[PDB]
């Protein structure tokens, strides 16, 4: 099982309630995007972390071009100053 | 339960043998440092190339890990392997 992990910094103008709303609405994408298996997010100049579980590297791409994900980006991309993305298979 | 996450880029000269020993030694710290509950690492397939996630009981046990001599030892030996590093400590939530 693979992970889609991303790390974010919000723009200064974004309020605390807005950041909270951002993650709540993101997590709700589990209700719309079949590829998303689980999501967790957290707050520790990056401040926030999001981890999504996927069946495979293939299913990650299904999430990427899903119309709800594209829609989320269009509404919310303006919230972040900068973002890093990582896709990988956890191993020990 | 809290998460210790770090993301790294190795310096260009670092070999595949050095990289594997690096994660092999780091993963092995679970057996030495009680605070470390589990570890997984991965290489990005999409700057930063590698991901390491450590699970801890709480933020208190993270500090036990931080000053543990085996952890300090890992840092002294292996810190020269990485060009850049980001560290995050956070509680996962939904």
From Swiss-Prot, chain A:
Reaction(s) catalysed (UniProt annotation): 3,5,7-trioxododecanoyl-CoA = olivetolate + CoA + H(+)
This enzyme's EC code(s): 4.4.1.26
Database matches in InterPro entries: Dabb, Dimeric_a/b-barrel, HS1/DABB1-like
Pathway(s) the chain acts in: Secondary metabolite biosynthesis; terpenoid biosynthesis
Binding-site list for Mg(2+): 30, 33, 36
Keyword Cell inner membrane: no
Cellular component, GO, one term: cytoplasm
Keyword set, alphabetical order: Cytoplasm, Lyase, Magnesium, Metal-binding
SUPFAM superfamilies on file: Dimeric alpha+beta barrel
Pfam families: Dabb
Source superkingdom: Eukaryota
Effect on the protein upon substituting residue 48 to A: Total loss of activity
Enzyme class: lyase
Assembly and binders: Homodimer.
Biological function: Involved in the biosynthesis of cannabinoids-related terpenophenolic natural products, which have pharmacological activity. Polyketide cyclase which functions in concert with OLS/TKS to form olivetolic acid. Has no intrinsic polyketide synthase activity and requires the presence of OLS to produce olivetolic acid.
Protein name as annotated: Olivetolic acid cyclase
Species name: Cannabis sativa
Taxonomic path: Eukaryota, Viridiplantae, Streptophyta, Embryophyta, Tracheophyta
GN (gene name): OAC
